[PDB]
Amino acid sequence: GMPGREILVLHVGQGGNQIGYNFWKTICEEHNIDIRSNQRKSVEEDKVDYKSVFLVEAPDGFHPRALFIDLEPLAVEFLVKEMKLGSFFSEDLMVLSYSGAHNVWSIGYQTGKKLIPVILEKIRDTMPETLQGFLIIHTLGGGTGSGFGSLLTETLKKEFPGKGVLNFSVLPSEVNDVTLAPYNTVLSLNHLSRFSDLVVLFDNTALIRIVKDQLNYPVIKQFSDLNFLIGRVMASITASLRFPGPLNMDLMEMAHNLVALPETKFIIPSVAPLTKEESEMSTELDLVERCFDPTHYMVNCSGQGKTISSVLMFRGNIAIENAFSIMTDIKSNVAFAPGVHPDLGLKYGICESAPVDFDKEVTLLSNNTIISEVFNRVLERFDSLFNRDWYTSDYVNAGTSKSNLKEARDNFDRIIKIYKEIEGSQ
């Protein structure tokens, strides 16, 4: 393949590695590759494909340019034993311990430091020198994905300051929800605010919300369909980086197009359609309108907020003449933040390659002031436990003082206030 624009994906934690099943299955099938055989799946290949952005073409076949990192071997057993994809999720890409983090951010940050030198060794000895950056896929409610993920986000930014560090971060839900999740989320989001170039946030609560308000089946099994859906959504967000088009971005351009101020780096993603039934009942306009509907947000929002910067992607069999017309009407109805010209608050583009199961797809990445509301509910749950000194013992034991917890919370509130000043409401 052609050198350049190569990305190294880092799955950290149980969720981040388990999400990698349908993340890489969707990526492989959109570039005509069988994840079971590491080979192409059909002789029908399109003339230009940027599969080298996420996949490595060896003489024996295609492999993920990824490292699968965890302080416990449970998630990689799910990939090799349950899914039978050991030829794709192979051992040379695995950095594993067997101690665990026990859902404490501090234990993953400190135990993860003992695996950092070997992770940097694999990056130096195996990654191309034209590597554009890193993609970190992890959860924020536990200890490995949060603590080790925060450490890796910080370590990669310090050792490779010329490359892009992008975080696909999953917020805590009500299932797989520890009472320690408010502490871990605030600690992780404070670190990511300092070292990540862009944090796209996912919430299992939002997918559950869509289940309870739909006859159609979006999940019928726990995480095996929820993490299945998260992997497909965050693979659709990467479509701008691996397919030719007007909005073909690299990691830096994806951050530059959405991060106006250094603190406004938290993006809300929206994808429609989510199911085959929705795809068979919807037109292009309906898919654009749902993406700007908080019901289809991957973060749980009450209403909509005000948009600072947004990037929309048309995927597949979409008439470009109607795409021009739809976005003129959407710019008139969308509430932009006070001071943003509508032409500078929303950019869009068409991608010819569509998801395998859908004729068309629409994806929205939005830097929206409504993330202050999602974060203020995290702050309320943080303070409901911290002001009573509840569930704090194991963070101090592992080296994160209660003063360090306070500094993370107070810097978390400063980000909320910045988004609210931009909104013009606080």
Strand partners, 164: 133
Tokens of 284: 């292009």
Same domain, 27 and 59: yes
Same domain, 335 and 220: no
- The Cα-based distances of 373 to 148, 196, 285, 387 in angstroms read 27, 21, 28, 21
Same domain, 196 and 52: yes
Nearest CA to 111 out of 96, 121, 125 is that of 96
Type of residue numbered 33: I
Tokens of 145: 């994905």
Burial 123-144, CB ≥16 within 10 A → b, else e? beeebeeebbbbbbbbbbbbbb
Experimental method, per PDB record: X-ray
Same domain, 246 and 275: no
Return the beta strands (E) in 210-359 as ranges.
266-272, 307-316, 346-351
Nearest CA to 291 out of 236, 351, 373, 359 is that of 236
Same domain, 356 and 261: no
Q: Mind giving me the DSSP string for 17-31?
A: HHHHHHHHHHHHHHT
Alpha helices in 172-262 (DSSP H): 181-195, 204-212, 226-237, 239-242, 251-256
- Judge residue 286's burial from the number of C-beta atoms within 10 Å of its C-beta, 0-12 exposed, 13-18 middle, 19 or more buried: middle
Same domain, 207 and 274: no
- The CA distance from 210 to 292, in Å, is 15
Element (H or E) spanning 136, and its range? Answer: strand 131-139
Nearest CA to 29 out of 184, 293, 236 is that of 236
Cis before 172 (ω within 30): no
- The CA distance from 92 to 123, in Å, is 12
Same domain, 89 and 214: yes
SS3 220: coil
Domain end, chosen from 370, 389, 408, is at 370
State which residues form the domain around 308.
268-370
Angle, CA of 244, 246 and 251, to the nearest 5°: 70
Angle between helical axes of 371-386 and 402-423 (0-180°, round to 10) = 150
Domain end, chosen from 267, 287, 313, is at 267
SS3 365: strand
Same domain, 163 and 193: yes
Q: How many domains does the chain have?
A: 3
| φ/ψ (deg, to 5) at 374 | -65, -40
Type of residue numbered 253: E
Burial 297-336, CB ≥16 within 10 A → b, else e? bbbbbeebbbbbbbbbbbbbebeeeebeebbeebeeebbb
Tokens of 11: 């799955």
Same domain, 341 and 245: no
Same domain, 384 and 313: no
Nearest CA to 10 out of 178, 145, 180, 184 is that of 145
- Give the pairing of strands 307-316 and 360-368: antiparallel
- The Cα-based distances of 130 to 18, 178, 373 in angstroms read 28, 40, 39
Cβ 270 vs Cβ 304: under 8 Å: no
Return contacts of 1-5, CB within 8 angstroms, 24+ apart: 1/51, 1/52, 1/57, 2/52, 3/52, 3/128, 3/130, 4/130, 4/132, 5/50, 5/52, 5/53, 5/130, 5/132, 5/241, 5/250
Tokens of 327: 């976005």
Same domain, 297 and 189: no
Domain end, chosen from 267, 290, 308, is at 267
Angle between helical axes of 181-195 and 149-159 (0-180°, round to 10) = 10
- The Cα-based distances of 214 to 206, 278, 360 in angstroms read 13, 10, 21
Q: Mind giving me the DSSP string for 268-283?
A: EEEEE--SHHHHHH--
Same domain, 179 and 200: yes
